[PDB]
């Protein structure tokens, strides 16, 4: 459990789960491989668990597990979306064996430079809300925020609802963006900024008319769409949207 964390940002201060100012400005943030580095190898651990699930639950050889995992991931943005639809997998049981079994407490540590950068972004007055927009389920999302010491830095969370049993609504699908817009109180896309490591997700935000979309590419792409700004480290946001950090 994480109830013994005492460092700043270790407590969630926004609500999980009525009009507002229309001129609202919102910066959306992906979480995985965004608020922490892809070199943490957390994504590798996730893929290991996911591939194990395909093998143990779908009785597939490792090579066929890779093919099916990649196929679903490519077209859906989440393998679990395909497992739900075609294999009648329960997404919450899956989630217990995958994201929720990661040894995060041994990997993620408070990220003070990230905390300070986000504080500066909140304090300029240029952005009204920092909103999390993740394909993870809420358990994992919250756990990452608390461990990284940034859980008080966001005004809300839009996560993929793994409780659904027909399909999952997730990035890069437009319905996921619509949900993020509604939940955050965002009136127009043109009042939104977005950072994500997924090229396809960035592609959707751009196509939808978001103001500025930043594609986070640490080393090599796992493709960057027309109109996106590329950085290799989230701490480079101050380099590329500098004005948002100034009063």
Residues that bind ligand U5P (CB under 6 A): 30-33, 46, 78, 99, 134-136, 171
Considering CB distances under 5 to 8 angstroms, the limit depending on partner class, which of Mg ion, ligand U5P, none binds residue 241?
none
DSSP string, 95-139: HHHTGGG--GGGT----HHHHHHHHHHHHSSS-SEEEEE-SS-HH
Choose which of 25, 26, 32, 127 interacts with Mg ion (CB under 5 A).
Answer: 32
Choose which of 10, 33, 69, 204 interacts with Mg ion (CB under 5 A).
Answer: 33
| Nearby residues of 68 by Cβ (< 8 Å), 6 or more positions away | 54, 58, 60, 82
Instruction: Rule CB under 5 A: say whether 99 interacts with Mg ion.
Output: no
User: In the complex with ligand U5P, which residue's Cβ is closer, 101 or 124?
Assistant: 101
The answer to whether the CB of 164 falls within 8 A of the CB of 29 is no
Of the candidates 190, 240, 180, which has an alpha carbon nearest to the alpha carbon of residue 210?
190
- Minimum CB–partner distance for residue 98 and ligand U5P (Å): 6
Can you tell me the distance from the alpha carbon of 219 to that of 211, in angstroms, rounded to the nearest whole number? Answer: 25
User: In the complex with ligand U5P, which residue's Cβ is closer, 185 or 205?
Assistant: 205
Considering CB distances under 5 to 8 angstroms, the limit depending on partner class, which of Mg ion, ligand U5P, none binds residue 204?
none
Instruction: Rule CB under 5 A: say whether 30 interacts with Mg ion.
Output: yes
Encoded tokens for 92: 């919450």
Number of residues that bind Mg ion (CB under 5 A): 4
- Minimum CB–partner distance for residue 171 and ligand U5P (Å): 6
- Minimum CB–partner distance for residue 49 and ligand U5P (Å): 8
Considering CB distances under 5 to 8 angstroms, the limit depending on partner class, which of Mg ion, ligand U5P, none binds residue 46?
ligand U5P
**Owner of token pair 């300070």:** 116
Encoded tokens for 6: 């005492």
Can you tell me the distance from the alpha carbon of 243 to that of 232, in angstroms, rounded to the nearest whole number? Answer: 19
Instruction: Rule CB under 5 A: say whether 118 interacts with Mg ion.
Output: no
Name which of residues 180 to 239 contact Mg ion (CB under 5 A): 197
């Amino acid at each position: 459990h994480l109830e013994s964390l005492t460092h700043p940002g270790s407590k969630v201060t926004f609500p999980i789960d009525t009009p507002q100012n229309p001129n609202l400005k919102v910066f959306f943030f992906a979480i995985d491989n965004c608020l922490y580095k892809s070199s943490t190898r957390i994504h590798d651990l996730m893929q290991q668990s996911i591939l194990r699930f395909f093998q143990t639950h779908l009785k597939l050889s490792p090579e066929d597990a890779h093919v099916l995992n990649n196929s679903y991931y490519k077209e859906y943005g989440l393998a679990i979306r395909g497992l739900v639809m075609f294999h009648k997998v329960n997404a919450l049981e899956y989630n217990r064996l995958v994201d929720d079994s990661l040894p995060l407490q041994d990997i993620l540590k408070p990220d003070i430079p990230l905390r300070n950068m986000l504080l500066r972004l909140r304090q300029s007055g240029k952005i009204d809300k920092l909103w999390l927009f993740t394909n993870a389920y809420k358990n994992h999302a919250i756990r990452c925020l608390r461990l990284l010491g940034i859980a008080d830095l966001f005004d809300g969370l839009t996560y993929c609802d793994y409780s659904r049993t027909d399909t999952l609504v997730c990035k890069p699908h437009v319905k996921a963006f619509e949900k993020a817009m509604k939940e955050s109180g965002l009136a127009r896309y043109e009042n939104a900024y977005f950072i994500d490591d997924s090229g396809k997700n960035i592609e959707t935000g751009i196509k939808l008319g978001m103001k500025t979309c930043i594609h986070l590419v640490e080393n090599e792409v796992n493709q960057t769409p027309e109109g996106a700004i590329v950085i290799s480290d989230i701490l480079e946001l101050p380099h590329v949207v500098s004005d948002l950090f100034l009063e």
